[PDB]
Curated annotation (Swiss-Prot):
It holds the Pfam family Phospholip_A2_1. It is found in: Secreted. It comes from Deinagkistrodon acutus (Hundred-pace snake). Belongs to the phospholipase A2 family. Group II subfamily. K49 sub-subfamily. Keywords: Disulfide bond, Myotoxin, Secreted, Signal, Toxin. This is Basic phospholipase A2 homolog acutohaemolysin. The record marks 112, 117 as: Cationic membrane-docking site (MDoS). Monomer. PANTHER family: PHOSPHOLIPASE A2 FAMILY MEMBER (PTHR11716), PHOSPHOLIPASE A2, MEMBRANE ASSOCIATED (PTHR11716:SF9). The lineage of its organism: Eukaryota, Metazoa, Chordata, Craniata, Vertebrata. Residues 105-117 are annotated as: Important for membrane-damaging activities in eukaryotes and bacteria. The record marks 105, 108 as: Important residue of the cationic membrane-docking site (MDoS). InterPro entries: PLipase_A2, PLipase_A2_Asp_AS, PLipase_A2_dom, PLipase_A2_dom_sf, PLipase_A2_His_AS.
Length: 122
């Protein structure tokens, strides 16, 4: 769920997830997907694409178990759909950390309606 995702992002990047990624670029947070503006934005594009494989659970409200130990994220003993959700989130959180070096403050609160549709598939 959003609660696990938020915690992961905070644990990996040390930044508040809502403020820093709630409206970032054309793919992070609210809204759907669009042509990614940068690496961070791309992380969000891939993440939302990942959620497509979830057919029996809610990536928004459904809770799953995971552990943050030894600076690593480990998905716990979850049902198939929940585990897939956890792995989607895990890869996303790592992706964000990997691209902190190009995080753009000007993209933090982006005008999503100005985003263009992409031709790239999931």
């Amino acid at each position: 769920s959003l609660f696990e995702l938020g915690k992961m992002i905070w644990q990996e990047t040390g930044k508040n997830p809502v403020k820093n990624y709630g409206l970032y670029g054309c793919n992070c947070g609210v809204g759907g997907r669009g042509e990614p503006l940068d690496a961070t934005d791309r992380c969000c594009f891939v993440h939302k694409c990942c959620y497509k494989k979830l057919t029996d659970c809610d990536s928004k409200k459904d809770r799953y178990s995971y552990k943050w130990k030894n600076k690593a994220i480990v998905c716990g003993k979850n049902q198939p759909c929940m585990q897939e959700m956890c792995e989607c989130d895990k890869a996303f959180a790592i992706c964000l950390r990997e691209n902190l070096d190009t995080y753009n403050k000007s993209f933090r609160y982006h005008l999503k309606p100005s985003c263009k549709k992409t031709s790239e598939q999931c």
